[PDB]
Write a protein that binds this DNA or RNA. Structure first.
Lengths: 79, 94, 90, 90, 85, 78, 96, 89
DNA sequence: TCAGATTCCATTCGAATCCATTCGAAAATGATTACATTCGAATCCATTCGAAGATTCCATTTGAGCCTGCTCGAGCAGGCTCAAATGGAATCTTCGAATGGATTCGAATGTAATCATTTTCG
DNA sequence: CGAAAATGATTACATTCGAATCCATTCGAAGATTCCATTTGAGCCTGCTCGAGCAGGCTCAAATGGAATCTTCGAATGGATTCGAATGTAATCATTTTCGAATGGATTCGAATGGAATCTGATG
């Protein structure tokens, strides 16, 4: 139950930065589900990258390559 | 007291003015390790890897909430509902 | 050059009673070329990331894992591994 | 030949040459990368052709047309995720 | 009529007007341009596919707001979420 | 020439998308979006044509332009 | 140097070597491809940096931070279209 | 290897009195590498389409026209042409 | 009109940037080949241009019925406030696992000639 | 169904290149200890959503003109495509030198704290 550590206040802050004024009561479980799906995809790709290099540690470049594969390039952690 | 909608706009300004991370770090790291347990056992993570994951995920969620707010306004509301999330994710091909 | 010969061989293998038109044959050639280009590009990137020079079956295996959806990558990996083993044994 | 040694219908030498003509710098290509790639391409071709032929036979015809290919691809979730192209005539 | 046009594979636009429009648009990039017939056919296939997919998204948006009639605001919302607006 | 794409044709394209009813202001919006899409693709097709030092636009130029746009198409040589 | 002949700050020889390293099969690279590429990279760098420096001067700050880079990129239509990446520490554009 | 020297030279050319942090320097490095890789890939594909081996400034110009939007492409083409003309003189 | 929130002016300082030195790494110079591109001809396809015609789509008006927009009251769900409980951060401490660089060294890819298919075009 | 110009396949090196062992160092993991800031219920209230009945708008269908698309035919020509030859120039050795990367050190620009003056909001 580590997805319940993404609390109600954190999701409210993430919604405020998106410009959201009022929130339903069923938004938090939906948000947890979508975050879980996104994280599963990215982590699967990253672990594939670490496995190819015959390593036991996941580095930041594996994450960067995985994100670039999903089409979600990120600046500031290498490349 | 403040009327409902005052503090909401105050925090909207506050969190659109800043640049920090909005999720706690220990819960996110625990969740990342638990998810990664399904692909390979006895994995180690650099701190930079978890930091990169957190930045990417927060950016994703903020963009999704922007699309969801657009959907909510389309239907003449100010409250966001799960149907707006579903519509936004469907038009995005997710 | 094209893949019409081998596409026809595979079709005769799977559906011995069924033929194929020429527009469908062109579409199948386009599909084969698309998949081949994707795999080749990803394998080249994988080889570059590790500071290696030779492309091997490990690069192809990782490219197939990264490009194909699950339950489609597993059978593809099995077919490729079986083909490589049969090739090496002989 | 190499294809018969591996037990495939797709060509191993031609795919090896195509892979060699796509490596950056002075890169080399192993002989089993071609076997793996030919196995993957043959597997995907057979899957698509099998679904299309089943659709055609359910329509009580003897040939495969682009409409059959589109019906086969769009009715499968994996082939839908993999193939996002527009099929001309489907 | 929905079933009639969803179950066919033809082209739903006349060829001559589309050819005229394509040539007029292209004349803004280079004068004295020539076209193969296959180029115009490919352009027509791609454009019809694009419009059909956009209309599917537009219908989703119309249903979201509890309507059956599609309005320009649905096209605008679909295109903004897609990334075109 | 954008008025040669008639309202019955737009109705047919909407019906193939599952649309039951149409507003009367949808046809001009459709013409605008089609014009934008066509300009985007034809720009790249003519770029590819000019690189090869040709005066004729071929189907390969259109196929490459669509593939660049993210709208891959099968059945025209690629 | 070649960069001084061309009149640039970015390196022509190093970019030539990288271009040679990123060619498929047996590929040759001319000496003016490197000049063209260095000019393009310098132009884009200068545009981004000028916008970011204007943003930095707006808030009375001497140094440039990722917040200023994000503000510069998202306020420009062409830069927004070209740069779709995520900037670590850039926030969002305030708009209610 | 990095681009920090040339990025700082360009910065001191544009704004001669403002500095830059190290996180911003890393972001600028990533940006330059991203654009360079895009241009190189496009040029290689263009060379393969015409059945040629050498990559020239014509391939670079076509890749710039295909990858950059609007007035960015026009000004970039102008700058690159000026640089090549000054170099070959 | 009064309690909260927001922004601004002073002070110090410590986290961070800009400047200064040595150096192996790489860039520029100078011939030398070959390798690839360019410049004339010479077919030879394939696009544009014109003409015609029954037809088959498209255009316009009317009208009815269906759909959408508006007003209004009810309730219900979300926001704001506050007091208590909890768990993150952060600052060391130690250790226990695992990259990454060298040095052999054994595995394997490409090049050269000669076939012996083999695929592509009638 | 037939012919023949590509083009894999075989034999044999030469030599890169990719593996196997070892050694150190980073660095990542596991413990521990607080203050304290963040989260959690719970209550109270208000404004926002929603349903129903009207009222107005406006879409679809049908019929009758009428108009312009579609296919076929055929010259005319121009513009891609191939074939040699002739250059233009990029890559390859061999030196020599300059430059950019890592290491240190002196300002100094961002970053808490501490009030103070407005700004704004809400009930009277």
């Amino acid at each position: 139950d580590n997805i319940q550590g993404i609390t109600k206040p954190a999701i409210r802050r993430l919604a405020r930065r998106g410009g959201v004024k009022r929130i339903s009561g069923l938004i938090y479980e939906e948000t947890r589900g979508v975050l879980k799906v996104f994280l599963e995809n990215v982590i699967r790709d990253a672990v594939t990258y670490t496995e190819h290099a015959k390593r036991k540690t996941v580095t930041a470049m594996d994450v960067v390559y995985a994100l670039k594969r999903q089409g979600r390039t990120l600046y500031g952690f290498g490349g | 007291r403040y009327r409902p909608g005052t503090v909401a706009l105050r925090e909207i300004r506050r969190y659109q003015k800043s640049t920090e991370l909005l999720i706690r770090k220990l819960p996110f790291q625990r969740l990342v390790r638990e998810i990664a347990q399904d692909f390979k056992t006895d994995l180690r993570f650099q701190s930079s890897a978890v930091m990169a994951l957190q930045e990417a995920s927060e950016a994703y969620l903020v963009g999704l909430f922007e699309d969801t707010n657009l959907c909510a306004i389309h239907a003449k509301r100010v409250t966001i509902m799960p149907k707006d999330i579903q519509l936004a994710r469907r038009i995005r091909g997710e | 050059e094209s893949y019409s010969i081998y596409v026809y061989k595979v079709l005769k293998q799977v559906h011995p009673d069924t033929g194929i038109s020429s527009k469908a044959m062109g579409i199948m050639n386009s599909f084969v070329n698309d998949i081949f280009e994707r795999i080749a590009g990803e394998a080249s990137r994988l080889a570059h990331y590790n500071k290696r020079s030779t492309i091997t079956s490990r690069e192809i295996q990782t490219a197939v894992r990264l490009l194909l959806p699950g339950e489609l990558a597993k059978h593809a990996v099995s077919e490729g591994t079986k083909a490589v083993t049969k090739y090496t044994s002989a | 030949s190499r294809s018969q040694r591996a037990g495939l219908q797709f060509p191993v030498g031609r795919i090896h040459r195509h892979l060699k003509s796509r490596t950056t710098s002075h890169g080399r290509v192993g002989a089993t990368a071609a076997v793996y790639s030919a196995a993957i391409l043959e597997y995907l071709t057979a899957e698509v052709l099998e679904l299309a032929g089943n659709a055609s036979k359910d329509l009580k015809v003897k040939r495969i047309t682009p409409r059959h290919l589109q019906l086969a691809i769009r009715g499968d979730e994996e082939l839908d995720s993999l193939i996002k192209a527009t099929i001309a005539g489907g």
